[PDB]
Amino acid sequence: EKTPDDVFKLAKDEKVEYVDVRFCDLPGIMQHFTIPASAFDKSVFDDGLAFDGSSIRGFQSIHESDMLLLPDPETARIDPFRAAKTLNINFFVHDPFTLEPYSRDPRNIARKAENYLISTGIADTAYFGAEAEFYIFDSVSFDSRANGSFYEVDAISGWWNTGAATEADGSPNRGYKVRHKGGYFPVAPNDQYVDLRDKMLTNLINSGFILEKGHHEVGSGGQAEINYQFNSLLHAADDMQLYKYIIKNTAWQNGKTVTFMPKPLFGDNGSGMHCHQSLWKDGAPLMYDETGYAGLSDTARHYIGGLLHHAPSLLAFTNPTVNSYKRLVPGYEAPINLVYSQRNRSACVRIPITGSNPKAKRLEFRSPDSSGNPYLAFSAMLMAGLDGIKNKIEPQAPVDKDLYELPPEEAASIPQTPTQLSDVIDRLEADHEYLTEGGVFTNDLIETWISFKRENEIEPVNIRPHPYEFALYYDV
């Protein structure tokens, strides 16, 4: 409930030199420009500020370029990195003529989703808790040419380096490198990132995050995870974007490089963005029933029914990259089919063991990753869950087994996760009505998304020969 004057006071008290104006592009990267403290006045709140909509992905064409920005005082935070004292604020994108909210502003979609939820009477609050895992690498390089292509990531703790004569700077190999699938979570010196993760935890604390934990993750070569307290949809998506900024730049300032890509390593764990979800109304929880499987109420079970039913199109917003589908393979604690199960890290929806406290009851949607847009992803998940409640969609029976080790004939009788991005985009195009309910998603957004993924991602990868095709086929 922060006000314009609250932000002006914060700026004065902190002796801010610059204000960094931020907003979200369609794919999911934050955009920014800087104004001096002297130019940060009431006119910023009253009239807004302009930018070139044609240079932003999924936004405007060149002849309709000018767009407008209006501040969100809830999102004002001091930047931990800039030597000149800087205040970061997120903005909403508006039409420069009518001052109406932009149909392709991701932050608007989240706003609309929250208001639609209230309008259904089902609940008044949707809580999102997320676990954005990442890799702390030392280096990366890659190219793509007519006659060749390559990539390489590297990290001191990568198992591929056990036989190295020296480290990259010429210093001795001192062992204690992380085995593949072996990073979760031995003490130092096996864990070579303790001090860096502490700096990440501290930078988050100093940016107003309420912290829960930090640890090394399963993957070799510096996989990590940090958890902060859940929040309502829009706040949670704003938290995600700032979290990624703080992780990436703490690493950068300390000589490292971070990636949130779903699957940077072949034959080791990918990086997921599990989303814990619950609905509340009038300050009371709605997910709990002592007599249901895994202690779940009807509302909760139908929300799951919606998620698993809509998955074939929903993944276009929750798993939105070509790389996403290299993670959805068996053996790495990511989903390979559409089942819910308690305590089950091989499942698509896991129900965490929380006991008899009704407040703690929730579902963990394990399918999503961090390769896209949290505003759009959280919103799409909500729309799928709500369609499930409204149409009382029953999920198929929980399967309490290692889903990777299912016998072939039982495995076949269960719907699989989509194989590739082109499949989920096709399915989104064919069936997206649940998303357009209440105008939360509009057709122009959905069509822009489909077009962007095909032209900029699917096709560019499809036309380029893969290095493994040379391993397979050079001698045909």
Ligand X SMILES: Cn1c(N2CCOCC2)nc2c1c(=O)n(Cc1ccc(Cl)c(Cl)c1)c(=O)n2C
Ligand Y SMILES: C[S@](=O)(CC[C@H](N)C(=O)O)=NP(=O)(O)O
17 classed as catalytic? no
Active-site annotation holder among 138, 191, 217, 268? 217
What is the C-alpha separation between 156 and 273, in angstroms, rounded?
25
- Length of the chain, please? 476
* Contact present, 395 and 376 (Cβ < 8 Å): no
Listed in sequence order, the residues at least 6 apart from 402 whose beta carbon sits closer than 8 Å to its beta carbon are 346
**280 phi, psi to nearest 5 deg:** -125, 150
Chosen from a copy of itself, ligand X, Cl ion, none, partner binding at 421 (C-beta under 5 to 8 Å by type): Cl ion
The region of 5-13, 265-273, 377-385, 399-407 touching ligand Y under the rule CB under 6 A is 265-273
Asked if residue 96 binds a copy of itself (CB under 8 A), the reply is yes
Asked if residue 66 binds ligand Y (CB under 6 A), the reply is no
Site for ligand Y, residues 221 to 240, rule: CB under 6 A:
225
Q: Over the range 144-173, which residues count as b (16 or more CB within 10 Å of their CB) and which as e?
A: eeeeeeeeebebbbbbebeeeeeeeeeeee
Chosen from a copy of itself, Mg ion, ligand Y, none, partner binding at 403 (C-beta under 5 to 8 Å by type): a copy of itself
Q: Which is nearer to a copy of itself, 173 or 436 (CB)?
A: 173
Q: Write out the two tokens for 473.
A: 């086929």
Site for a copy of itself, residues 175 to 214, rule: CB under 8 A:
175-176, 180, 184-191, 194-195, 197-199, 201-202, 205, 210-214
Site for a copy of itself, residues 254 to 313, rule: CB under 8 A:
256-257, 259-268
133 classed as catalytic? yes
Asked if residue 324 binds ligand Y (CB under 6 A), the reply is no
Name 36's bridge partners.
Answer: 18
Active-site annotation holder among 82, 180, 215, 345? 345
469 classed as catalytic? no
What is the C-alpha separation between 309 and 307, in angstroms, rounded?
6
Tell me which of 73, 292, 352, 438 binds a copy of itself, using CB under 8 A. Answer: 352
Helices (DSSP H) in 177-323: which residue ranges? 194-205, 233-253, 298-318
What is the C-alpha separation between 247 and 253, in angstroms, rounded?
10
Minimal CA–CA distance to 417: which of 313, 332, 323, 341? Answer: 313
Task: Determine the angle formed by the axes of helices 298-318 and 421-430, rounding to 10 degrees.
Answer: 120
Minimal CA–CA distance to 16: which of 32, 39, 50? Answer: 39
235 classed as catalytic? no
DSSP state of 294: G
Tell me which of 134, 135, 303, 332 binds ligand Y, using CB under 6 A. Answer: 332
Report the SS3 class of residue 98: coil
Binding track over 305-344 against ligand X, x by CB under 6 A: ----------------------------------------
Chosen from ligand X, ligand Y, a copy of itself, none, partner binding at 133 (C-beta under 5 to 8 Å by type): ligand Y
Give contact residues for Mg ion (rule: CB under 5 A).
131, 225, 274
Q: Which residues carry out catalysis?
A: 52, 131, 133, 217, 225, 274, 345, 364, 366
Give contact residues for ligand Y (rule: CB under 6 A).
52, 55, 131, 133, 184, 218, 225, 269-272, 274, 327, 332-334, 345, 366
